[PDB]
Amino acid sequence: YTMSLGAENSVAYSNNSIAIPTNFTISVTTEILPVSMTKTSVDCTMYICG
Amino acid sequence: LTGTGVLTESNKKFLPFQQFGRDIADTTDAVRDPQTLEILDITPCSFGGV
Amino acid sequence: DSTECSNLLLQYGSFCTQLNRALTGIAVEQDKNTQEVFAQVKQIYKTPPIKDFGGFNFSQILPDPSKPSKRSFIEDLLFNKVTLADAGFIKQYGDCLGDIAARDLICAQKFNGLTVLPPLLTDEMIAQYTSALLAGTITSGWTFGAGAALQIPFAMQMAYRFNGIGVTQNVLYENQKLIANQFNSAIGKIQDSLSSTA
Amino acid sequence: TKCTLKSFTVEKGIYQTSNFRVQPTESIVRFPNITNLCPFGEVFNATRF
Amino acid sequence: FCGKGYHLMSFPQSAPHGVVFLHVTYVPAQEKNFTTAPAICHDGKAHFPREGVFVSNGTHWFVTQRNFYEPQIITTDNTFVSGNCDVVIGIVNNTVYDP
Numbered sequence: 001y002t003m004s005l006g007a008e009n010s011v012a013y014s015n016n017s018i019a020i021p022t023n024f025t026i027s028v029t030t031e032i033l034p035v036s037m038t039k040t041s042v043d044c045t046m047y048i049c050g
Numbered sequence: 051l052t053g054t055g056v057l058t059e060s061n062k063k064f065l066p067f068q069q070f071g072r073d074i075a076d077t078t079d080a081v082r083d084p085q086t087l088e089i090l091d092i093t094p095c096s097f098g099g100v
Numbered sequence: 101d102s103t104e105c106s107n108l109l110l111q112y113g114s115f116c117t118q119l120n121r122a123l124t125g126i127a128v129e130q131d132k133n134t135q136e137v138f139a140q141v142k143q144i145y146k147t148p149p150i151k152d153f154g155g156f157n158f159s160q161i162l163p164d165p166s167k168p169s170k171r172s173f174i175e176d177l178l179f180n181k182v183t184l185a186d187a188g189f190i191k192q193y194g195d196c197l198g199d200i201a202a203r204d205l206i207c208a209q210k211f212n213g214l215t216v217l218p219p220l221l222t223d224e225m226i227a228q229y230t231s232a233l234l235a236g237t238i239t240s241g242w243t244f245g246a247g248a249a250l251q252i253p254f255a256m257q258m259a260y261r262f263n264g265i266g267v268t269q270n271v272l273y274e275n276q277k278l279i280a281n282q283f284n285s286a287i288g289k290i291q292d293s294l295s296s297t298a
Numbered sequence: 299t300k301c302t303l304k305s306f307t308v309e310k311g312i313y314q315t316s317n318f319r320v321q322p323t324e325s326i327v328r329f330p331n332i333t334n335l336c337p338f339g340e341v342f343n344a345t346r347f
Numbered sequence: 348f349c350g351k352g353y354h355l356m357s358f359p360q361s362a363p364h365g366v367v368f369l370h371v372t373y374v375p376a377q378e379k380n381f382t383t384a385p386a387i388c389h390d391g392k393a394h395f396p397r398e399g400v401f402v403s404n405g406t407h408w409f410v411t412q413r414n415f416y417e418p419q420i421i422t423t424d425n426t427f428v429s430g431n432c433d434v435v436i437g438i439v440n441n442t443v444y445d446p
């Protein structure tokens with residue numbers, strides 16, 4: 001499929017109109033970031049000489 | 051097959067047409083001794099990564 | 101075009117497989133870079149017709165509805181100013197080295213196995229994302245990213261950003277025409293700077 | 299550490315060292331229990347190949 | 348930068364080879380249209396809001412904070428006076444209450 005670019009909605013603009021919310025929802029969202037990878041090392045004699 | 055290392059006893063089983071084994075095909079992990087039919091796996095002499 | 105290849109593959113193609121994996125990782129990384137820079141908010145707000153922006157002229161940066169292409173005027177000059185491979189390499193490779201996305205496979209065999217993959221996001225989609233960001237900002241202030249449809253006049257948005265920098269609303273509302281004229285003149289100066297082949 | 303770093307002065311921290319400490323001294327040979335010699339002479343002195 | 352909506356808190360939690368955040372955000376809803384004005388000209392002088400916006404339901408004007416709809420009567424402590432109202436474009440006519 002073509003990529004969904006986003007939520008499709010329209011807003012009405014006027015020079016003397018403002019929209020103010022009358023309610024609110026407290027939403028808790030998760031987001032995940034990596035920190036570190038596997039800490040590795042190589043042994044030279046076992047690698048080359050064996 | 052000549053080399054330098056320390057050999058231990060192994061629990062591997064060898065097919066009758068197989069004498070030399072490789073787990074990772076760069077070093078011979080185990081050999082079958084020509085006199086006694088026990089299988090001895092060879093490890094590198096210096097190891098542990100000091 | 102070697103007469104033996106499978107032996108050569110089995111002996112030395114694993115390095116190329118690893119390096120091709122590195123290139124594929126770089127490519128997916130680059131696509132995710134474009135994703136994270138242009139798709140921060142996935143909301144598509146249609147550009148309103150230019151009405152009552154307080155005297156500010158945004159007709160240049162907004163896309164023109166007359167043109168079927170969704171590129172606006174300033175980004176059109178940005179596209180025309182940058183010429184892909186403006187050197188002797190366009191004579192050597194026939195512009196196939198750049199990502200024109202209409203290149204033929206004769207350019208691919210010209211490069212001897214090197215290929216240019218098209219980007220994940222079409223430039224038209226980038227233009228649509230930029231138009232959505234511009235329309236959302238100009239209409240709703242900073243409430244574009246929170247997630248809502250909070251329309252606000254542009255005068256009050258200028259007033260609250262003036263409160264942000266530390267100046268009261270009265271300075272804006274007494275000098276609205278002067279600020280609009282200065283902004284329009286600055287946009288015209290940017291237009292003349294890009295249009296004069298500088 | 300001085301031998302792996304190729305310097306007579308080392309700095310503070312941890313360093314990984316290659317094996318310079320052990321050398322083999324004895325050698326063993328293990329061959330199959332074969333006693334009889336090959337008929338190389340019989341093949342080589344053959345009156346007609 | 349820390350979640351969709353206005354950020355309030357984040358709670359860290361450990362993860363294998365990473366860290367996860369629990370972003371607590373303020374997401375508004377249930378919008379309402381309102382007729383607004385930039386200022387109010389009373390007694391020949393313009394009144395600008397110290398905080399929030401000027402909104403009107405029907406024919407009565409109030410001052411409310413931007414993010415939430417809390418209607419408050421227009422009061423001289425809530426507004427500040429600066430100049431006359433002939434220079435402000437789009438100013439409306441109303442009275443300001445003084446306590």
Ligand SMILES: *[C@@H]1O[C@H](CO)[C@@H](O[C@@H]2O[C@H](CO)[C@@H](O)[C@H](O)[C@H]2NC(C)=O)[C@H](O)[C@H]1NC(C)=O
Pocket residue numbers: 022023024025377
């Ligand atoms: C704002 O929305 C919340 C829900 O998101 C409303 O809370 C509900 O209120 C009704 C009646 O008081 C209860 O029966 C529901 O159980 C409540 N829901 C939750 C999730 O708590 C709240 O009333 C709304 N406020 C306004 C002014 O509309």
Ligand SMILES: *[C@@H]1O[C@H](CO)[C@@H](O[C@@H]2O[C@H](CO)[C@@H](O)[C@H](O)[C@H]2NC(C)=O)[C@H](O)[C@H]1NC(C)=O
Pocket residue numbers: 157158159160
């Ligand atoms: C915003 O500026 C553009 C030009 O930068 C204006 O477009 C011009 O409009 C006049 C007629 O109004 C034409 O004669 C010119 O040819 C147009 N120029 C270009 C480059 O298109 C536009 O009218 C301005 N918008 C407002 C609201 O003033």
Ligand SMILES: *[C@@H]1O[C@H](CO)[C@@H](O[C@@H]2O[C@H](CO)[C@@H](O)[C@H](O)[C@H]2NC(C)=O)[C@H](O)[C@H]1NC(C)=O
Pocket residue numbers: 404405406407418
């Ligand atoms: C706009 O909303 C306000 C707040 O509810 C209204 O003010 C009160 O409305 C009630 C009911 O109509 C009256 O009994 C009070 O006397 C009003 N108080 C004040 C200080 O005016 C106001 O009436 C609403 N405006 C319209 C046009 O409905």
Ligand SMILES: *[C@@H]1O[C@H](CO)[C@@H](O[C@@H]2O[C@H](CO)[C@@H](O)[C@H](O)[C@H]2NC(C)=O)[C@H](O)[C@H]1NC(C)=O
Pocket residue numbers: 438439440
């Ligand atoms: C707000 O009220 C003032 C008067 O208190 C209005 O000013 C008058 O407007 C009429 C009609 O436009 C003129 O004929 C008068 O000459 C004006 N008098 C003065 C002293 O300016 C003003 O127009 C009103 N504004 C709004 C938006 O209703």
Ligand SMILES: *[C@@H]1O[C@H](CO)[C@@H](O)[C@H](O)[C@H]1NC(C)=O
Pocket residue numbers: 085086331
């Ligand atoms: C090989 O010969 C030696 C010497 O006679 C003997 O000790 C050993 O057991 C033999 N190994 C066999 C038969 O596997």
Ligand SMILES: *[C@@H]1O[C@H](CO)[C@@H](O)[C@H](O)[C@H]1NC(C)=O
Pocket residue numbers: 337338339340341343344345
């Ligand atoms: C060849 O050598 C073998 C020993 O390997 C011997 O038995 C044989 O008699 C020799 N034959 C001749 C013709 O010398």
Ligand SMILES: *[C@@H]1O[C@H](CO)[C@@H](O)[C@H](O)[C@H]1NC(C)=O
Pocket residue numbers: 012378379380
């Ligand atoms: C506000 O008005 C616009 C157009 O007049 C309309 O599309 C929108 O739904 C209205 N919003 C509310 C909350 O009624």
Ligand SMILES: *[C@@H]1O[C@H](CO)[C@@H](O)[C@H](O)[C@H]1NC(C)=O
Pocket residue numbers: 015016152436437438
């Ligand atoms: C809003 O626009 C209408 C129509 O263009 C106009 O009559 C009115 O004066 C404008 N009001 C303001 C405050 O700009």
